[PDB]
Design a protein around this ligand. Structure first.
Ligand SMILES: COc1ccc(S(=O)(=O)N(Cc2ccccc2)C[C@@H](O)[C@H](C[C@]23C[C@H]4C[C@H](C[C@H](C4)C2)C3)NC(=O)O[C@H]2CO[C@H]3OCC[C@H]32)cc1
Ligand SMILES: [Cl-]
Ligand SMILES: [Cl-]
Lengths: 99, 99
């Protein structure tokens, strides 16, 4: 689709069989989702946001559907105020900025 | 232009007579610039994201040149390491997310 920005660019994602709402975030390098259980092992990562740094759990090669498009990649899990889809997955679904 | 997201979508901006680099950020409601002086009145504001909240100065009716595209709107000024152009000015230059 073509998504204008008068409202937050919120989309439905499917991860772990569950539907969630997430924000398409070109200002995010990484994808960050609120606390949920994911399979496999995870690795530590510190990420920096507007208010400071937080610890997250890094799960690699996670299957996730994003507004109907299939991605398989790294998902960070932690106390983010909102689920965000960052450039690591926006590139997988072929998204670009246009003006 | 069409901007891919393989890397950070950074552009040149002109604001308060200064040239600066800024991130085109669809996840940002508002435009947030690193500490600088701007003309006019301002009022304090708290904005939040990963890591918590920061205090900023809200300047209304500021003109910015974004990648050669003129826009006017509210600009928040405060302690961020990276300038971000948020949806309130992205709309004004007709930016969209496409995939
Ligand atoms: C009301 O007006 C607002 C305007 C801005 C914001 S915001 O907190 O800056 N954020 C919105 C937001 C994000 C998450 C949850 C809720 C809201 C925008 C994100 O795009 C933000 C930008 C930056 C802007 C600068 C430079 C960096 C670090 C921070 C300052 C936040 C990205 N990017 C981010 O956090 O990315 C993180 C995940 O991916 C990683 O890679 C990059 C750092 C790691 C909140 C309110
Ligand atoms: Cl505005
Ligand atoms: Cl429009």
């Amino acid at each position: 689709p073509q998504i204008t920005l008068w409202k937050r660019p919120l989309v439905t994602i499917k991860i772990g069989g569950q539907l969630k709402e997430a924000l398409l975030d070109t200002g995010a390098d990484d994808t960050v989702i609120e606390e949920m259980s994911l399979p496999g092992r995870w690795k530590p990562k510190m990420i920096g946001g507007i208010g400071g740094f937080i610890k997250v759990r890094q799960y690699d090669q996670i299957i996730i559907e994003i507004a109907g498009h299939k991605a398989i990649g790294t998902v960070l899990v932690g106390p983010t105020p909102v689920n965000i889809i960052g450039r690591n997955l926006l590139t997988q679904i072929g998204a670009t900025l246009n003006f």
